[PDB]
Structures are given as C-alpha cells and as structure tokens.
C-alpha cells in the first residue's frame, strides 16, 4: 500500500493513498505562508507602500529594481500576492478516485485539483466544512481582487538569481510551481462537484472500501478519516482537539485497533497554553482600550473567532466597557455568523441543550441584539459613518498581507497607543509585520491554539496502540526552536517512520485475506469433519458470483493426504470380500499382495504403489477402497 | 546539451527516492525540449528505465507523456513504448502510466492507421489486465482509436464487467466510437436494457445517454424509439437528481415519437375541472427536488412542444400552473417557453392567470417577459382584448417606469389580430353619440397607450377612420410625428457618396500644393484643416477618417510653423527662449503621434510607417532644436548617437515600405547615413536642418472604416453639490460607470485615473470582469473607485478621468468630471 505526501506544510497536507484496487485523495492544502513574501495589496495605495526603495542587483545585469523593493533592509517581491500548490506530478491525480476534506482549512486549495488536473472522481465532506469553505474561498477570492495589481515578476523566480537573492527569498520552495488565485467561477465549480457527509456515515466505495468521518473536535464540522476493509484498518487524523471545546468532542473510541495511523496538524506552538493565554489577550486588550488607543485584531471570519467572542462577553463586564464598541469588518462576517447559529446538531452537549431550551446556542447573537458588536460587510460604506474610538476591531485576513487590515493598519501604525492583538498561531508574525516595520503600534503576540500537544499525543498513541505510525519528519526532529527540549518531539514503538515533501513511502502492510461471503444452500449442503481437536474442516466445491467487489459462492480439483494403515487395509479387505492376502514387512513399509488381479502393494511413509494386471473393476475398486482411508483436501 | 547534463546528473546522484524525484520535479516543472532532442532525451530516460521503485519509472513516463505533446517524436518513440510495454509488466501503476503514454501518442500528431493506430490498438487489446491494471484505460485507448468504418464484440463482452468503473470506462469508449459514427449495431439497444437497470451511480447516467443515441439512429425494434423513450419515462424518477438531469435533456433532444404514447406521460384533474367549469413522467418530473430538474423539464417540454405540432394545447397548463414557482430562474425559463411555443394556441379562459402574474414586486425581468410573451400569444375572443387591456392598464399605473415596453406590447398585440378590437372601438375611446368629448391629454401615458393599439390595428381593416372621433386625427398626425416606431403610415386624409469623395478632393489637393512659398502653405493647411473638423462633426460615418486626417495634417502644420520660427536668423550663442516655440511644438507632435497611433481602431501597417516615420520627424525636430540651444559638445555628441541609433532601429524594424517611402525625411536620411555616422555632430546638426528644410510631405493612404475610441463617463454626474461625506482615513466608494465606443482589447488598457485636490494622481486598474458587452465594439464599464484622506476643512473636488494606455505612457480620452468631497475627523 503506497503513500504519497505531496505537501511537505505539517499543518496542510496532501496525502495520496492506495488501498485495494482504489487510490484515494485526503486534503488539498494551500500554504499560504508563501503569500507572506509579498507586498500589501492596500485598498487606496498609500505613499510609503508607493515610494519604497528598490533592491538593487550587486552585478546589476538583470533590471529587479522593479521587481524587488525593500523596507526595513529587508526584502519582498512585488506582485499580486502568490499561493504555493501541492506537487501534483507525482502521479497523475486524473487517476485518482475520491477526495476526503478534513476540515475548511485543508480543503482551501480545492479548486485547483478540482477543476484543472481534469479530476473526474468524487469529493465528501462535512456540511459545515463544506460551507464554511464556501466562504472562506468567497473572502479570499474578495480580497484578491477589488483592487487588480496586475505586475508579474517573474525574472526573479529563476533559480540561479534565487540563490543570490538574500533571506528569506532564498527559503522558498517550489518556486516554479506558484500559481495566481483562482476566481469564482472555478470556486462554483468546485463546490458543485462535492457531495455531503454527515457523521459516521458509513460511505461504501464500490465495495472496495468503507470510509467514515468521525468527529475531531479542532473546529466547527472537522472530521478525521477512517478507511477500512474487512480485514484492515488506516485512521488518517488531522488536526483534532481533545481540549474543551465548542464542537462535538472528540471520539478516540474508534481510533484503536488501527492497522496504519497517520497523524497530521498537531500544535503549532506547543508551550502555548490556551487558557492563560486567552487571559493575556483579554488583560492587554482592556489595558489598551483603557488607556483609550484603539485595538485590531486580526483573525478569519470562523474559527477561533467565536471562543474569542464568547471570553469577550463574559470579561468586558467585569470592567463596565460597556461604551467601546466591537465592530467586526469582513465581507463575510454576516453570512458566517448565521451559519455558525444554524449548526446545532454539530456543536458541544453543552450548546445542543442550550438550543433544547430554545434559545440561539452561541451568544454572540445576543451580543448584536444588544448592539455592543456590529457586523460590517466592508470598511467602505455604512461603517465609515458609524465609526466610533476607542474600539476594538475584528479585520478579516491574518495573513496580513491583504485585507481590510493592511488599511486599518498603515492607517494605525504611526501612533502608539494603538495596539495589534495576533491570534491565528498559523504564521509567523515576525514576518508577517517585517513590511510595515518601523511600526509605534504596540505588537502584542498572544497566538491561541488548540489542536493536541505531544503529550496528549504519546496519550493517545499509548491508548490506541498503533501497528505503525507515520508523521511529518518536522515532529520526529525537535524544533529549532528548542534543540534541547525533547518533550517537543514525537515517540512511539515502533518509531514513526517520517516523511517530507513530494514522497513516496511503502506501508509494511500485506494484503493476506479479505471477505467472501457463503450462500446458504451450500453451506447447509456442506459437512464439516474433523481430524484435530477442535478442527473441523470439509473439502469445498463450488462456482464464485463476483459483483461490485463482492464475491459470493453457490453449488455448480480436492487431493489426499494422510497414511493408510496395512492392518486395516487388509482388515477391511477381508471384511469386504477379499481373501488369500499376505502381507510382508520391510525395513519401513509394508509389501502387500492380493493373489486375485495379482495386486501388489507397498506402502512406506507418505508414499503409496499398487501395481496390478490390466484390470479395470478391481482397479476401481482397489481405487475406492484405498481412497477412503484418508483425509480428502 | 540539456538533457544531456540532467541525464548525467540523475546518473550519478542515484538517489532512489530523492535524485530520481528531484530529477523528474526539476525537469517537468522548467520546460519542454522545444526541439529534435526530445528523441535523445527519451532514449536517456529508457535507458535508466532498468532500474527498481517503479514509482521512478512512473515518473519518467509521465514526463514522455508530457513530451509528446510537442509533436516532435513520430515512430521512433512509438516503437521504443510498444517494445517497453512488451516486457515492463509489473503491478498496475507502470502499466498505468505506459497506457497513458501510449494513447497520448496516438491521438497527438499520428491519426493514421499502418502502425499508427492498429498495431497500438492491437497491443493494447492482447495487453488486456486482470485486476482493474488499466482495464479502464486499455477501454479508452481503443475508443479513441478508430478502427476503421466497417471491434464492437470485446466491448460486448467488457458491459457485464466486474467493476462498475470499467462499465463506465466501456460506455465513454462507446461515447467516443459513437461521436465519430461507426453506425453502431441494433444489438446494443437490448444489451443496454440491463444496463438501465444497473443498481449503482455513475453507469445509469450514461447508459441513459447509450440507449438516446442508439434509439434516435432508427425506430425499429417491433416500436423501438418509443420503446427507448418509455425507458426513459420509467427511469426519469431515478433515485439521484444527477441522473435526472440527462434524463430530461436527452428525452427533450428526442423529437420523433408516437403520438398517441407522447401524451400517455402527461396523463394523470383540477385543470380539467376548471375547463369544464368554463364551458406518467411529466407529471412527476415538473415538479421535482432542486430547480435544475425543473429547467431541465421545461427544455425538454419546449423542444418537443415546438417538434411536435399537436401536444401542444395539451401542456398549456402544465406551463401555466407552474409559474409560482418561487425561483426566479424557473419563472423565466417558464415565460420563455410559453413565448417560444406561442403559436396556434388558445387561452380562451387561461388569459386571466396569465395576466394576473403582470403584478409582481418589481421583477423587472418577469413583467418585461410577460409583456414579451404577450406580444407573441394568441387570443380568439373579444372579451380577452378587453380584459389583457384593462390588466395593462392597471400594470402601466402602478409601475410607470416601462410604459416604453407596454406600447410595444399593444402595437403588437393589435398587428397580430386586428378585427378583433374593432368592437371595442366606441367603448374604449369615449365617443358619447351627441355630445362633443373633452380633448383628453394628448401627452396622457394611457391614453397614447390605448391609441397606439387602435392605430395599429388600423392598417388591416380600411373602416374605422369613420368610428375615430374629432380628436383622433390631429393625434395620429402628433403620435405618427413623434413615435415612428409605434404606429405606421395610414390613409387618413387628415395626413395624406459626395461626403466621401469631397474629402478625397480635399487631402489630395493638400498633397498637391507643397510647391510654393511656407506662407501659403501655412494658410492651406488652416482652411483644409478647419474643413476636415467641419466635415467630420457633420458625418457620423466619416467621424473617424475625417478626424485622423485632421490630426496628421496638424501635425504637419505645426512641424512647418516650428521650422519657420525666427530663432533660425539668430547666431547660436544668441538663443534666448521665450519664442523657441520649436520646444513645444516637438512635444505636441509627439503626442498627436500617440494618440493617431493608439486611439483610432482600424489602423494598416502603411499608416503605422507613416505615423513612424513622422515620430522620427519630430525626434529629429527636438534634436535640433536642443542643440541650437546647447553648446556642450559632449551633450551634443551624447544626443546625436541616440538620434541616429533611433534612425538605425528604424530602418532595421520597417525594412519593408522603404521603396514606398520615396524621397522622404527618412528615405533620404538612411541613403545620406554613413557621413554621417562618421561626421563630428556639430556639422549633423546643421546637415539635419538643412534636410528637413527641404525634406517632402508624405502622402498618407485613407484606411476603409474606421472609427476613433471614445469614452463617456456617465455616472457619478458630478453636478451634485451635495458632498460625499466619511470619516477621516477611511474609504468611500465611488460608482464608475462609462461607456467605451470602438476600442480594442479594453481590459487591458483603458485606466481610471482619480485627481486628487493636493496634485496627486493615482492611477487604478479595473478588473477584466468590469467590461460588459452589450454590443459590436459598444464596452460598459461598471466598476468601484476608492477614495480616501485625511480631514478637510471643506468640501473639495476630486477628478475622475478614463485613460487609455500603451505599450510607458497614458492618453486622457475623455472628459474629467469633478466629485464633491468632505472628510470629516473622528468622532467619540
């Protein structure tokens, strides 16, 4: 059973499996780390974004004074912002059959393999994934355009200039394969190819295989994957959340006894706690908003969003900040907090009693009938009247490379009172501000997390007990970060056989039995019998039915096996009507002989001769009699 | 070379699963050969073929695969992959991949049989797998591969397969065999029959489009379309909605049935209760899950409706009944094929709901359909004239915005059945017998309404001038004289290309009076010049080539008032400005050379030379005129290699029309250029004086119709003085609307460009998706422009224009319109 990664992102893979006569798909990862390289994509082009000084190349044959500028002593390529792409070369995905989505954030990438490898097999996914992909890739597509920065550079990308050119530019992977955002007419497309899932749904495939989505708990509609046979079990689970959460709580119950375990989308930040640090966001936030500056956050329309929102709710009365608004800027806010309220059968038991007792589970709808939160589609229009300060701001992308953020933010940065509040732990904010930097804003990084950390992962292994174990090479290696620490790197037994981009692994896996199933008729035509304790076999005959995958055998060459004892051979011999017998013994067998057709026998150990005249009723006889004193197989 | 080195480079790194990866990534990922090497190439990598992981293997031949693309590889590579694939049987995936190869060979340049297509096909039939290897693509391999028009029995066989995905790998081959004809046999249909009944996705959905396409070839089984259409009936509740859908769409492109079978699908009635008060497939499929089966349905009803005269009447009903429907897709869909099936039909009592949906919220879509519908249905009683009427009425006061349609509508509903509304002549129009009736309004948008109808009606039946009133007539002369295209010439006795040529004359007059003194020529550059405007504002037609000419010959004006400016009888140190006017007059021609060159639409390579070679003129013109007033003779030197590398790109890039180019500027330039390369600049200055002093006027040929770009930027108006107000910092939108006339590739180059108050210009690029095409050569551009800055005291003015760009400069093509402003600070 080959696996193929095609994404070496830990949080974002793209796994090829073969199984059976079938080769299934799991997640489309779109790295959008590549993005950070890139300039902003304001939404009224701003002086110093305009007037930035160009990087010079040292031997100067090339013109990148146009394509490269630099702030800071740094550098950034200058374009509409990029999106690295799964290796799709590897094997031709046309042949792969079905697509499992894990959760929106592994499914973001959809449309590329959807629609240009000329895919023509199916995609399953949960409804809330489904949708809330729908959105995300409506924001994104959003703020992609609305402003079209048509420069391309492209001289850069050769390689032999990437090598020069100096860091991070020269970390980047994949260059080549870079790709321009889709738009929505491949979005609509995508979409319509899918087809839904609910939980445990036990989706057969061709009879081939049998997958189900079980509840993850990491967001609102995450699903980790299991695919078996009949005989065979591979739990692909990526990115689940065992901590108190809002979703449905993980269910670790059917994970165990799993032939293959993949394991993907642990922590980003594993010291990171979440409670404590959800605390500092609320403690600076207030400090802040009490010194009278105002506060952005940035953070996507789902998600994290809404545990943020319920900690706000209850902590903003504890200081009586009634009068500060929350305003909540995105072109989806509105669409993703219904969904959010409709999906009651999804969410915790806590919130599925809530909504029992009739009443909207989460209270972010009670906070905009109160109207301390409002929900904006964009900066331009209605907000710009109803503006207020201080405030708290809720922009859209954490990316911070396009955006109502990147507005807000050059509109902010001068001053120092104002304060930006990271949440998303999924990209480096070092990075993220290295554009904007000299910045007075005061930066504060609390990012929030919630995936399992490594010990409730060697918790997990333990529990489950795994036949074999295959994770990122980045979780066997300890992070960079902390060489010393080993807590901060996988461990198992076996160890986790690893992997990184674009490769090929073997599962020490055979492929030994699978199902058949009897037919009664047969069956109760069929005697069994016995030759050991508690053994009892029977010889088999019959023709095979084979439909979708499935094999079935009704009633339309068997060989002996087994000494034949001399004592009763000529005891039944007698008994039957043989006479004028005589039997010789020799060094290991027994000579034989019968005086009527002149039959001679020797028997020895696993070896039996008769040699008569040119007879054919005794010999049938002989045939039948010496037949029968054995075991038939 | 290339490939070469990357063969030696996967040599010797050898890696298993890295270097041969790697390889294959870098490789794919670059480029193509581009040329013969990818025979070598292809070699090299079959000669590493022997080696273990076949995923190596795999990749490789995906890379041959992509490779032949490039239609360079022929028969060697053909018998390298047949020789392969004779020996390299080794699990499924390197079969996979050699199958792929294989038929990305065959069907890229060959298409020919002998070697080309049947021994291919041959190898892959004996190469058939056991365990779904490439059973599939083997399937495929063959479809796509024609024998010839005589292969039908292994597919037979194939049909009752193991694996479903194999049936319907079978099926797109049958698909592919079909598409080019291959007169498919009978036997098929019955082979089929089971096929419908296949109990699982993705092969009914096809073996419905099987069974369509044998069945329309011939109706001959015992009835065999009508067979195949009750096949169709029966499966059209299929469990899915994805097979719904074909299963609609095929029934509909079916068009020849029996007729007595054809209403058995809409036999069940409430419809026929209400008839009766006055004096099954489709009965299931118009009303099913999702609207997509629904607009499948009602193509399928149209398509059939409009083969099938009779059948008819019979769904008139059906269509009525469900408009409803709540989805505004469904509800035009609905309206468009009741208009579509509209004719010999009768809505003797189904003319009041019909009407009743004219009321709908706004719906401008669904009212504007039904009045489209309206003018092309049929009604046979007077009653109904009466009744649409008074319903059009009541629509035409409640939304008086589409009156221009509801006369439309009457017109043609009085054309199509005149006789009919004659009746109705005294009641309609108040004609008390012996009182004089009170003028009504003439301008009334009700009663021009029920005129136009009368008149309309007028043109057939010659008695009713005598039931038309005292007022009537005075009105049909008022309406007949302000809507032409309402109400047609009647028998009331009451109301019983030099363009072209001249300007010829004129341009060739032009080009032939250069013999005389400058004076002259000053004065007939003027009047012809003022005549060209004159012309091209009188025309329409002409507007283009008129205003062209007109710019070219200004051009040349201003390059004569240059030349003959007084600095020339001044010594050069004397050069004092304040009348060089040479200075500027070197700018505006090169930007008249621009804006000839870009703005106008149908431009010939001859008139590109010209303006070219006028764009030299005028760069000699600069070049002399900058050295009259700069001494520095390294600046001059500097100066005059640019101008002469200018000339030398020239000549190069426009080798051709040189010999047209007779005794001209450049012309005598080039054949004058040796000297002076090897001149000192100083004296090349003076030799390019002196040659454009008696240099020729060139004669420019008049292109066939043309027209010039031209924006109009409609909203926001501008003259409204009420402020756009926003806090400080933020963004207000601006709604940008204009209309683009006669421009080329608009996408990629008209620019909105936004003025601030403070000097600065920012220039904004609209998306590809802003440009609508209602019509020939006619853009809409709808887009949003973002403004934004900090607080001001007042309001101000913020400049709109549309640019037009060029490939390094921009031309305004369009009046700038003034936006009112006002930024306001924060508040609490």
Redesign the interface.
């Known amino acids: 059973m ?1 696996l193929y990664c095609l994404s070496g992102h830990p949080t974002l893979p793209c796994n090829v499996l073969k199984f059976k ?1 079938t080769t299934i798909m799991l997640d489309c990862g779109l790295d959008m780390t590549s993005t950070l390289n890139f300039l902003p994509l304001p ?3 701003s002086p110093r974004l305009s007037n930035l000084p160009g990087w010079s190349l040292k031997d100067g044959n090339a013109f990148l004074d146009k394509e490269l500028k630099e702030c800071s002593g740094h550098v950034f390529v200058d374009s509409v912002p990029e999106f690295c792409l799964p ?1 799709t ?4 995905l046309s ?1 792969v ?1 079905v697509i499992l989505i894990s959760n929106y954030h592994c499914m973001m990438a959809l449309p590329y393999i959807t629609e240009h490898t000329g895919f023509t097999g199916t995609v399953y996914a949960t409804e809330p994934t489904v949708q809330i992909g729908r959105l995300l890739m409506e924001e994104l597509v959003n703020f992609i ?6 420069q391309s550079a492209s001289l850069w990308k050769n390689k032999d200039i990437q090598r020069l050119l100096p860091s991070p530019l020269k970390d980047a992977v ?1 260059v ?2 870079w790709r321009r955002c889709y738009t929505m007419q491949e979005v609509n497309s995508a979409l319509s190819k899918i087809q839904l899932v609910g939980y445990s749904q036990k989706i057969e495939l ?1 009879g081939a295989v049998q997958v189900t989505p079980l509840s993850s708990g990491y967001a609102l509609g995450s699903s980790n994957w299991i695919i078996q046979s009949h005989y065979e079990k591979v739990s692909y689970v990526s990115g689940s959340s065992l901590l108190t959460t809002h979703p449905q709580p993980m269910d670790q119950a059917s994970l165990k006894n799993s032939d293959v375990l993949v394991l993907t989308g642990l922590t980003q930040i594993p010291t990171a706690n979440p409670d404590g640090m959800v605390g500092e966001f609320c403690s600076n936030l207030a400090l802040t908003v009490r010194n009278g500056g105002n506060v952005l956050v940035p953070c996507y329309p789902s998600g994290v969003i809404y545990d943020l929102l319920e900690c706000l709710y209850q902590y903003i009365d504890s200081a009586g900040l009634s009068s500060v608004p929350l305003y909540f800027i995105s072109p989806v806010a509105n669409s993703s907090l219904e969904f959010s309220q409709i999906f009651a059968e999804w969410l915790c038991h806590n919130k599925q009693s809530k909504v029992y007792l009739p009443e909207p589970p989460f209270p972010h709808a009670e906070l905009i009938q109160t109207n301390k939160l409002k929900h904006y589609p964009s ?3 209605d ?3 109803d ?3 201080p405030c708290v701001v809720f922009t859209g992308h954490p990316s911070l490379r396009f955006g109502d953020v990147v ?1 807000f933010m050059e ?1 902010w940065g001068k001053s120092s009172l104002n304060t930006v509040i990271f949440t998303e732990p999924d990209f480096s904010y070092l990075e993220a501000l290295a554009p904007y930097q000299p910045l007075a804003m005061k930066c504060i990084y609390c990012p929030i997390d919630t995936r399992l950390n490594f010990i409730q992962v060697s918790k997990l292994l333990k529990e489950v007990q795994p036949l074999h174990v295959v994770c990122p090479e980045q979780y066997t290696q300890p992070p960079p970060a902390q060489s010393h620490r080993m807590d901060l790197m996988i461990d198992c037994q076996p160890p986790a056989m690893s992997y990184r981009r ?3 692994l073997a599962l020490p896996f055979k492929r030994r039995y699978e199902k058949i199933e009897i037919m009664p008729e047969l069956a109760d035509s069929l005697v069994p019998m016995e030759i050991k304790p508690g053994i009892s076999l029977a010889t088999v005959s019959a023709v095979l039915h ?4 499935k094999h079935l055998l009704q009633p339309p060459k068997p060989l002996l096996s087994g000494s034949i004892p001399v004592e009763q051979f000529v005891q039944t011999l007698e008994k039957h009507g043989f006479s004028d017998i005589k039997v010789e013994d020799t060094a290991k067998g027994h000579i034989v002989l019968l005086q009527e057709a002149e039959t001679l026998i020797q028997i020895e150990e696993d070896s039996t001769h008769i040699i008569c005249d040119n007879d054919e009723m005794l010999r049938v006889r002989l045939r039948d009699l010496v037949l029968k004193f054995l075991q038939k197989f | 070379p290339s490939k070469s080195a990357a063969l030696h480079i996967d040599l010797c790194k050898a890696t298993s699963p890295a270097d041969a990866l790697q390889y294959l990534l870098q490789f794919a990922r670059k480029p193509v050969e581009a040329e013969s090497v990818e025979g070598v190439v292809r070699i090299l990598l079959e000669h590493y073929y022997k080696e273990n992981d076949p995923s190596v293997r795999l990749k490789i031949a995906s890379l041959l695969g992509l490779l032949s693309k490039t239609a360079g590889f022929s028969p060697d590579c053909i018998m390298d992959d047949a020789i392969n694939i004779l020996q390299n049987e080794k699990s499924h995936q390197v079969l996979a991949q050699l199958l792929d190869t294989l038929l990305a060979i065959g069907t890229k340049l060959p298409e020919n049989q002998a070697i080309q297509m049947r021994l291919v096909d041959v190898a892959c039939k004996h190469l058939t797998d056991t365990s779904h290897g490439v059973r599939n693509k083997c399937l495929q391999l063959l479809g796509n591969l024609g024998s010839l028009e005589k292969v039908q029995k292994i597919i037979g066989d194939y049909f009752s397969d193991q694996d479903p995905r194999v049936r319907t790998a079978a099926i797109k081959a049958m698909l592919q065999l079909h598409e080019r004809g291959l007169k498919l046999h009978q036997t098929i249909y019955n082979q089929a029959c089971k096929l419908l009944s296949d109990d699982y996705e993705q092969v009914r959905s096809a073996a419905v489009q099987l069974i369509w396409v044998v069945s329309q070839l011939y109706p001959e089984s015992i009835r065999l379309v009508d067979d195949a259409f009750g096949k169709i009936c029966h499966m059209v509740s299929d469990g899915s909605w994805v097979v719904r859908v074909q299963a609609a769409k095929l029934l509909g492109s079916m068009e020849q049935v029996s007729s007595h079978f054809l209403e058995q699908t809409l036999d069940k009635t409430a419809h026929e209760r209400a008839k009766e008060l006055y004096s099954g497939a489709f009965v299931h499929g118009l009303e099913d899950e999702m609207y997509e089966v629904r607009i499948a349905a009602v193509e399928a009803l149209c398509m059939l409706a409009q083969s099938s005269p009779s059948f008819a009447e019979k769904c008139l009903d059906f269509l009525v009944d469900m408009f409803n429907d709540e989805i505004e897709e469904v509800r035009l869909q609905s309206i468009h094929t009741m208009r579509k099936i509209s004719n010999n039909i009768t809505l003797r009592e189904d003319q009041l709901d019909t009407v009743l949906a004219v009321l709908e919220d706004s719906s401008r879509d669904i009212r504007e359909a039904l009045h489209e519908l309206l003018c092309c249905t049929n009604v046979s009683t007077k009653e109904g004239i009466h009744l649409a009427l008074v319903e059009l009425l009541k629509n035409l006061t409640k939304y008086p915005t589409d009156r221009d349609s509801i006369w439309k509508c009457l017109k043609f509903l009085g054309s199509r059945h005149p006789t009919l509304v004659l009746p109705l002549v005294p009641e309609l129009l108040s004609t008390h017998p012996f009182f004089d009736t009170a003028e009504p309004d003439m301008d009334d948008p009700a009663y021009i309404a029920v005129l136009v109808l009368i008149f309309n009606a007028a043109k057939t039946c010659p008695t009713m001038p005598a039931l038309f009133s005292d007022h009537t007539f005075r009105h049909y002369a008022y309406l007949r004289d302000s809507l032409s295209h309402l109400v047609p010439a009647l028998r009331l006795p009451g109301r019983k290309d030099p363009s072209q040529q001249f300007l010829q004359q004129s341009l060739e007059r032009v080009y032939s009076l250069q013999h005389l003194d400058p004076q002259g020529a000053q004065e007939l550059l003027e009047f012809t010049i003022r005549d060209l405007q004159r012309l091209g504002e009188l025309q329409s037609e002409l507007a283009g080539v008129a205003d062209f000419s007109a710019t070219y010959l200004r051009c040349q004006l201003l390059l004569i008032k240059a030349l003959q400016e007084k600095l020339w009888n001044v010594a050069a140190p004397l050069y004092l400005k304040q009348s060089d006017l040479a200075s500027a007059a070197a700018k505006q021609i090169m930007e008249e050379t621009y804006k000839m060159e870009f703005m106008y639409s149908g431009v010939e390579n001859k008139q590109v030379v010209i303006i070219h070679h006028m764009r030299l003129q005028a760069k000699a013109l600069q070049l002399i005129v900058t050295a009259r007033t700069t001494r520095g003779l390294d600046p001059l030197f500097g100066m005059c290699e640019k101008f002469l590398q200018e000339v030398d790109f020239f000549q190069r890039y426009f080798i051709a029309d040189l010999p047209h180019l007779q005794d001209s500027f450049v012309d005598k330039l080039l054949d004058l250029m040796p000297r002076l390369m090897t001149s000192k600049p100083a004296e090349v200055v003076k030799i390019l004086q002196t040659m454009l002093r008696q240099s020729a006027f060139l004669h420019l040929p008049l292109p066939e119709q043309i027209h010039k770009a031209s924006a109009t930027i409609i909203e926001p108006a501008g003259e409204s003085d009420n402020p756009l107000r926003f806090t400080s910092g933020l963004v207000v939108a601006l709604d940008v609307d204009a209309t683009l006339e006669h421009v080329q590739d608009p996408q990629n180059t008209v620019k909105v460009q936004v003025l601030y108050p403070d000097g600065q210009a920012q220039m904004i690029h609209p998306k590809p998706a802003d440009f609508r095409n209602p019509g020939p050569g006619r853009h809409r551009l709808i887009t949003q422009v973002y403004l934004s800055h900090t607080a001001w005291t007042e309001a101000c003015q913020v400049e709109v224009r549309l640019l037009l760009a060029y490939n390094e400069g921009t031309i305004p093509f369009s009046k700038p319109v003034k936006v009112y402003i006002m930024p306001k600070p924060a508040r609490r």
């Not at chain 1, 070369?89 to 031709?92: F, G, K, R, S, W």
């Open positions: 080959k006569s939404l009224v082009q290796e070369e590897l094997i031709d042949t059959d355009e609305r402003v079209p920065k048509a994949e080549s394969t061709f900066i331009h229009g907000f710009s009247n503006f207020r300060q507005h509109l674009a490769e090929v084979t439909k979708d995958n």
